[PDB]
Amino acid sequence: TMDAVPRIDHYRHTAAQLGEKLLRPSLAELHDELVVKFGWIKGVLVRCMLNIWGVMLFIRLSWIVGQAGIGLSVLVIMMATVVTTITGLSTSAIATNGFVRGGGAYYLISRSLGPEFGGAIGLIFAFANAVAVAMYVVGFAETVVELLKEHSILMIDEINDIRIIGAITVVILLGISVAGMEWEAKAQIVLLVILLLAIGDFVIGTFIPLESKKPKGFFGYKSEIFNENFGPDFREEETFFSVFAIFFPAATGILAGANISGDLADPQSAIPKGTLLAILITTLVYVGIAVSVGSCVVRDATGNVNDTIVTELTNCTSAACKLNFDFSSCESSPCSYGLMNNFQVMSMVSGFTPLISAGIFSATLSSALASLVSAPKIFQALCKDNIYPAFQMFAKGYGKNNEPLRGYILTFLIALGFILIAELNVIAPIISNFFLASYALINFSVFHASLAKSPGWRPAFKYYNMWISLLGAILCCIVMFVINWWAALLTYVIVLGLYIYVTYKKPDVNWGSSTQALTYLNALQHSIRLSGVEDHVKNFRPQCLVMTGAPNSRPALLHLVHDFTKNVGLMICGHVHMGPRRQAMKEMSIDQAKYQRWLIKNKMKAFYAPVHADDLREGAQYLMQAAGLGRMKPNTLVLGFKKDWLQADMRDVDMYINLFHDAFDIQYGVVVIRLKEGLNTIDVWWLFDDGGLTLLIPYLLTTKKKWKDCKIRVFIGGKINRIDHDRRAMATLLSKFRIDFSDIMVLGDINTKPKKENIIAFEEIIEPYRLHEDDKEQDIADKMKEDEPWRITDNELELYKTKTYRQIRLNELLKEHSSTANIIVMSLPVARKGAVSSALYMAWLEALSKDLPPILLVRGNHQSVLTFYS
Amino acid sequence: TMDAVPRIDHYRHTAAQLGEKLLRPSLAELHDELVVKFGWIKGVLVRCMLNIWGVMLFIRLSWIVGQAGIGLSVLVIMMATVVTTITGLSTSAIATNGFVRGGGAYYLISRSLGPEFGGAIGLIFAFANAVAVAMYVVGFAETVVELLKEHSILMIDEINDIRIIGAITVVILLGISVAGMEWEAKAQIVLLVILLLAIGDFVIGTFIPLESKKPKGFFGYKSEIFNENFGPDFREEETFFSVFAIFFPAATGILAGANISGDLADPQSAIPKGTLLAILITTLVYVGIAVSVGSCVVRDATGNVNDTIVTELTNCTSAACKLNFDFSSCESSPCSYGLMNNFQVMSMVSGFTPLISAGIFSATLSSALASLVSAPKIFQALCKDNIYPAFQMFAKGYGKNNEPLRGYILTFLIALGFILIAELNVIAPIISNFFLASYALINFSVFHASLAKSPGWRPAFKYYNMWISLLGAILCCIVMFVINWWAALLTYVIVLGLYIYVTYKKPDVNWGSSTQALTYLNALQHSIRLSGVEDHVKNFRPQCLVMTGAPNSRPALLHLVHDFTKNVGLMICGHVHMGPRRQAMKEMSIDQAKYQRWLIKNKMKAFYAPVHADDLREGAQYLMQAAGLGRMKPNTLVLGFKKDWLQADMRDVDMYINLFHDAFDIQYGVVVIRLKEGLNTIDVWWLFDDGGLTLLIPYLLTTKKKWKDCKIRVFIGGKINRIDHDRRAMATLLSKFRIDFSDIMVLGDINTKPKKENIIAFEEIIEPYRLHEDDKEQDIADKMKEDEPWRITDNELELYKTKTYRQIRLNELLKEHSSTANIIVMSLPVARKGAVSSALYMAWLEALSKDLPPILLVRGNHQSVLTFYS
Ligand SMILES: Cc1cccc(Nc2ccncc2S(=O)(=O)NC(=O)NC(C)C)c1
Ligand SMILES: Cc1cccc(Nc2ccncc2S(=O)(=O)NC(=O)NC(C)C)c1
Ligand SMILES: [Cl-]
Ligand SMILES: [Cl-]
Ligand code: NA
Ligand code: NA
């Protein structure tokens, strides 16, 4: 049947080849008459879980649960979890749209809402990961240094030992990462097993209370300790929000699995479930460990065997005394340790202490490895789009699975430098702010997509309410402020600067962002609003349709039309295409884009309006009948003077004059512009009341900065002995309209016979098109029907001598008075259709406008365009 | 010449008679073939000066100067003058645009920025003036009560005497106001003369030092007092902002002259200059009096001759002794005189004593008279505007000059009630905030008019910078908050409530406000923005041109098309008008308004688009070639099934089919809707790949609240023995597009001969259109060019039997399967142009769709409309 059935091969044209077996027929033919890929578990779940988990489970979780209450600590965890889950829901929604080629969160953000935000967030996120690797390596070095300092071993000052260990660790991590994407997965699995072993060791040792640890804070699940550990016992210059700020970074790292989207077996399924499961499991483990530590250890303790453990005569109505006096009465002296003074509680409540030490080692190393892997991927994805041209390179992949070795080396260098600094406690909040900004950008991506009701939003993952996403972005910003407000300001400024730079760069890319859909929707909504507004005389605007063909053919005329339309009124540059329909469609499709881009590149607020018809008359008919939307429709027809009418087929001149006639018939106002295309005052000779357009146009000219210094001087026609009366009337009328005029000149020389020379010149010019009916018999009635109506009938030439003499005399007056004007505006002669031939009308116009400064012959609708009523 | 020269009579038609000869010729006729008025001084200057001056020049200015030094008091006056001068500049700008028919600031505000704000501000301002009448009368009563209590002539308490005196004065003022406008002006002049006499008396007395007043603070213009008082004191619980709030109401009252616009000889010349002169003179007098009082009286004093006045040896480091010791050394014991404890200081520092009291009487009475005059004016103007229908009563005018007698009575009643309350100290801030809100609305009117760039702005008064006006409105809001913050919140709430009520009432009025111009400018700017956005498959929208004629003939089809276009994509209702051009233009002009209003009233976000042409074919050509603006152009022709084609001239059917053909030639998509107009699943039978529109339309259908429950079930064609493979392929394709489907059905019964009965029925239906070439001879070729291309040839009928049987069998299948669907979407058969006659195409469509639920035959553009990439 030649009509192809729906087939995936038809739509598959970017990630594969359709081939000969799949090719949808075009409408014309029917019409025209004749590599490593990971699963969701090992690719998203494990990476997300390992990135989320860190030293908080073994260092600060006990301190947080002590400073705050069990209930308040659980609340802090839950609120951080809200912020991360909302972010994860938004990420899954943005990832279940189409095929994600690679990159990571940068790819999702860019393909969602445009290269500007995409590049800003991509650079920020890549830098954040490149510095996070160094921070995690520094944490590992700190843990190793503390472990060796607890013994006698040491090489150099603590800082230098930290630097050495960090450098060795970073070198090893870079080697492992360069080894490949499978070795890294094996190492991640090993580290996860070790960390789970450490967690289980802590939980097992919390169930075995050894008396030797009694002088410590550990007691072994005593309900009295639990009841005493509620409430916010803040023993410092800190508060609830300080604890929240300290803990929240422990909820981050939820985008690790989506950072390697270019290596997943199948995104759109692995990312959502993997990320959500990782968030759930990590939050559950955090809550469990918080409660466990809060039900075993007392806040304060003075570890000492000599400490009274016999519970002699006393009351000391605290939780500790409820079972024994061990680690009691340090409310005045700074007792050694406890749930609020020792950060190794997890290492003591546990069993095998080196098991917990290895758990911390794995927690830091897994995060470092994940960051080192993820940052180069984002950088290479952002570089492959050439958003920052200098960053070209750092995008070449090596081996079967394209791996950014150059990005790997760059991340290694950045991490090594930041480790060489070795003092990173002041930079962590900036990195946290960067991550929070990325989360907020993802949430805003989802919200923007839901706001712009693009039919192609079509996300495969539900449970992504737009309002929840907006609330999540707001919460991300608020949490960003809650910790290191000045860091938040710095990140905001950096993001805004990058966004502005990218917007000004205007990169050559087009992805289908929600920004374009929202632009269309905004235009549609505003047009629909405007369609319900009644038109008023004082709200009239010149809405011009300029017949120019190619808008670049005559630039002076286009600029002039722009002057009195730019920012006030509509401007449609109409172009008529002629020839066969087939090639005409392709030519119009090319020209539309070419000329719209040309206009936008020259600051012309005009609309290109191509049209295909047999002749210019029919195309202009199309435009004057249909061009426009609702109330934004042309009311004025603008033409340029047919400067070549003298040497041109009379059919073209007839078409020009017929354009005039159809413009008048359709109740349009006609503006004919005659100026020298090759490349003071404004004189307005408006002698017939067209409704005011002749005055409105030059006033709008004066409203612009190009004609601000030009003063309007008016010319009118009067009767001798009555000059002053008419001048006063014109001055009063102009004052009522509030149009400033430098001078008013009343001329009685109109209606007088022009000179003999000018009449002779007009006759000589008009001779070739004269019919000369008198010199011929009735046979001439065939020329008037075949070689006509171009021919000028002697009857009309004698019946309209007044108008011809008026045109010649008016040209004389214009030359004598307005020769020094910057622009002339004059009433456009109107010829009744059927009474005057096209050739005679063209000759009238040519005689009127010949050899003068830029001139505009204006004939308005005759509907009132000005008013003096408020 | 029948062309009329410019003349004021053509444009003078709304506020004056046009006349016989005052009628410009219409473009068709030339182209078609064939009592008491006041001047600016007595009307604006005097009223503004008398309203601005209150009891602050004799009661509170001295206390203010005492509380804050000379410099700080001068600063307060200057800042209040900034707020008022900005307001006055905006008022002059808004009043020098057109002829101000009547009313006051209400008329200017309404004619500037729309009936909503106009009515809100008018009601609030009228109420403010009415209440101010009572407040000024209460001030007069208080002054008289104090004067008579100084001599113990009070009767029936004090408040109960204030009530009686105020009632008598209000009755007298009402009588004077009813007496006419000239008598009020004479009384105003008399009061002004008295007040100037009082001011001059104070200034003269300040130069006549008298030892009698030595016990009082007055000393005689001594420098030492000036240096002492040049600095702030701010005694008691007083602050700079508190004194500024106390003083600022003194600067108000600048709109008294503009409130009399309906009785001025020449507004646009009297209001601006008069108001500015009033502001200047009042501020100058205020500054002079403040400085003079600060240079002649000490802040503290104790008036007694027995007190120490010798100035003998005494340390008294304070500067009060610089000239004498009279009225000194009460820094601990409260004093009874001075610039901080006595308010009658002016009366004491003057010459004749009762003349100051007379000046106070005049100041308090002139403001009351002005308010009682102005409030009815504004109320009558806003009532003649008929913005609140219940208030149409208070619009009648009496006498030669329309005088709102009912408004006068209502204002008198309101003032009498508020005087009967007699305790207005708590209501003054409300009135001040109302006045400030009016000032802010005037400034925002000027700013909004400058924002929208309508050519009709054209204000005759310069010096009105838009940013200055916006700053003035902001300052007015801030000042109104500064004093009585809760009063400011209450006034804001009242203004917003009135604005919402007026917006929802939708009054039937059109004045060409700045809001409409801004709507147009916003739409144009958004369209210009959208014109620069590149096109992407992800952002494709269905932009439909529905050929419906009158948009109310078939409501069901319009609803159906609007369901999948509202909020997503454009919708243009195209109507073609035939007949003579002259009458056609008027018909289209009326129809455009009628149908746009009908659409907006019916909640259709569509655009009515009428064209004039001699046949539907070329009108649709106009629409498909030119309709739209920039990137908001249609790409899908929507047609209703010709249900009468069986009984209708075959020229109409040929035009319909050629509409199809031209739609395809212009590479448009085509949607044909067949549904019953007189009186839950969506079945998509898309069998040919059109690019995806057949699938994209029903999805958008399911995207709306009216089709949320319906589930999409798909039907495709397949080969027997491989049904499951094709079903899996279709399921995968739909999942990649993210279009939810309840079921997929693969049909092998296509391309099979339908029932004999159905073929016989099709033949019977098609019988009276066959060319019967075999039965006839070569002469039949004439019918192919005279009765054709309607006639169905025998060659085509025999050569396209497969397609006809396909249509019949497809209708059988749809009746068998989709008979219970809420809507059906099917692939529209495409007939090669020149190969199939129009009648056979129509019969194909009829056979395909009949005895079915609502159906959409969709033939997409064959360009990809869906994508599974991101
Ligand atoms: C890079 C960076 C910057 C700022 C804060 C964090 N913290 C995070 C982040 C994600 N998951 C857990 C944590 S954590 O709870 O602090 N555990 C942890 O081992 N942090 C190490 C840096 C010592 C990480
Ligand atoms: C109706 C009203 C409400 C609130 C404040 C004012 N004050 C104004 C207004 C205009 N010019 C001067 C003043 S004034 O300086 O306060 N003098 C004065 O006599 N006010 C009298 C009410 C006693 C007026
Ligand atoms: Cl992350
Ligand atoms: Cl006022
Ligand atoms: Na980790
Ligand atoms: Na007054």
Author numbering:
A (entry chain A), B (entry chain B): 217 to 250, 282 to 926, 1022 to 1212
Article excerpt on this structure:
Loop diuretics, including furosemide, bumetanide, and torsemide, antagonize both NKCC1 and NKCC2, and are first-line medicines for the treatment of edema and hypertension. In all the three co-structures, NKCC1 assembled as a C2-symmetric dimer in which two TMDs are separated by ~30 Å within the lipid bilayer and two cytosolic C-terminal domains (CTDs) interdigitate and associate extensively with the TMDs from beneath.
Torsemide lacks the carboxyl group which is indispensable for furosemide and bumetanide to co-occlude a K+ ion and contributes to their K+-dependent antagonism on NKCCs. Our NKCC1/torsemide co-structure showed that torsemide adopts a U-shape configuration with its sulfonylpyridine group, which marks the U-turn, facing TM1b and TM6a on one side and the propan-2-ylurea and methylanilino groups projecting toward TM3 and TM8 on the other side (D and EV3C). Just beneath the extracellular ion entryway, torsemide’s propan-2-ylurea group forms salt bridge with the main chain nitrogen atom of Val302 in TM1a and also engages with Gly301, Val302, and Met303 in TM1a and Met382 in TM3 via hydrophobic interactions. Further toward the midway of NKCC1 ion translocation path, torsemide’s methylanilino group projects toward a hydrophobic pocket and interacts with Tyr383 in TM3, and Ile677 and Ser678 in TM8. Our MD results showed that the favored (i.e., more stable) state of torsemide is the one that features a protonated and positively charged pyridine (Tor_NH_N, Fig. EV4E–G). In this state, torsemide’s pyridine can replace the K+ ion in its binding site, while its deprotonated and negatively charged sulfonylurea can substitute the Cl− ion at the so-called site 1. On the other hand, torsemide encroaches into and expels the K+ ion from its binding site, suggesting that it could be more potent under low [K+] conditions. Another intriguing finding regarding loop diuretic pharmacology is that the sulfamoyl group of furosemide and bumetanide directly engages with extracellular gate residues of NKCC1, but torsemide’s sulfamoyl group reaches further toward the midway point of the ion translocation path and makes no obvious contact with NKCC1.
